[PDB]
Amino acid sequence: IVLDHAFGQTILDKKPERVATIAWGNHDVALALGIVPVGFSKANGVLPWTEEKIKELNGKANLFDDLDGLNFEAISNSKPDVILAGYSGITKEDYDTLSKIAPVAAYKSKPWQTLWRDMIKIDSKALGMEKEGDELIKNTEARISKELEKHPEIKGKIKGKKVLFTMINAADTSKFWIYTSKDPRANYLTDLGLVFPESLKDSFAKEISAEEANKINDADVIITYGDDKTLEALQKDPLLGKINAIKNGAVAVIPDNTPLAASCTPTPLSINYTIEEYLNLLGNACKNA
């Protein structure tokens, strides 16, 4: 197997008997394909849906201690035939260091800029299951499509609505992050029927000033990580409270440090697990748009 990526070409094992994954989501792609990794990146350490699939494949979860950074000794100790990194933020040196252990399936373009469909495409190809990658993508799309046609009143409230995904901190509202269309969590919203406003363009996210906030003023609905005081807080903000979607209360707050929060960057396993919960949260927010 030949694989082209941001760092060149990778000769991969057609039948990898031992699979390691790093970064976010990559393990879910392997797992959704019936492969239990010999080790995958510990999450901030396993999400409910990742555990559910591991159990269903009669496996156990082996975790790399990837919090402070890549654990090169851990990945090496698991003895992989392939390292899945289709969605990751690896640097040129990361790729080189990792390549001394096993062939690496890196992202195609730039760090942290891989849509959930491409993540499957790269990770499945690196496992010698490119055709099965097609089916996984199709099955995942079917799950999304049948959820929206299943609840036409939620579909009706959210379709056509312009949306921005943000990271806002109540501690500091002078600066906040906007996720771009190259970000998997933002682009996922377009799979749901939402659209991007005219003020979005590259990177996966960009810092913006609250003065530049009137550029985000053409969004119908806003999504951000937060808590039960987030919306009330943003409405109280001298500048951010003047924004359309915030003023209207059309803000979808994803509870920070919950499984729902992690699923925002979608995998076929996470989508299958949290889409009802995610649509319900979006549905109510878009009611205020």
Residue numbers in the entry: 40 to 83, 91 to 247, 253 to 340
Publication excerpt:
To obtain sufficient iron, S. pneumoniae evolved two major highly conserved iron ABC transporters, which are termed Piu (for pneumococcal iron uptake) and Pia (for pneumococcal iron acquisition) systems, respectively. Pia system is responsible for the transport of hydroxamate siderophores such as ferrichrome and ferrioxamin B, whereas Piu system for the transport of heme from hemoglobin. The overall structure of PiaA is composed of an individual N-terminal and a C-terminal domain linked by an α-helix. The N- and C-terminal domains face each other to form a hydrophobic and plastic cleft.
The structures of Se-Met substituted apo-PiaA and ferrichrome-binding complex were subsequently solved at 2.7 Å and 2.1 Å, respectively, by molecular replacement. Each asymmetric unit of the apo-PiaA structure contains two molecules, which are quite similar to each other with an RMSD of 0.24 Å over 278 Cα atoms. Segments 1 (residues Asn84−Lys90) and 2 (residues Glu248−Glu252) at the entrance of this cleft are missing from the electron density map due to their high flexibility. Notably, Segments 1 and 2 are located at the N- and C-terminal domains, respectively, indicating the cooperativity between the two domains. Different from E. coli FhuD, the most N-terminus of apo-PiaA structure has an extended β-hairpin, which may function as a hinge to connect the N-terminal transmembrane α-helix that is inserted in the membrane of Gram-positive bacteria. Superposition of apo-PiaA and PiaA-B3P against the ferrichrome-complexed form gives an RMSD of 0.31 Å for 262 Cα atoms and 0.45 Å for 283 Cα atoms, respectively. Superposition of the complex against the apo-PiaA structure revealed that most residues in the binding cleft undergo subtle conformational changes, except for residues Asn83 and Tyr84 that locate at the invisible Segment 1 in the apo-form.
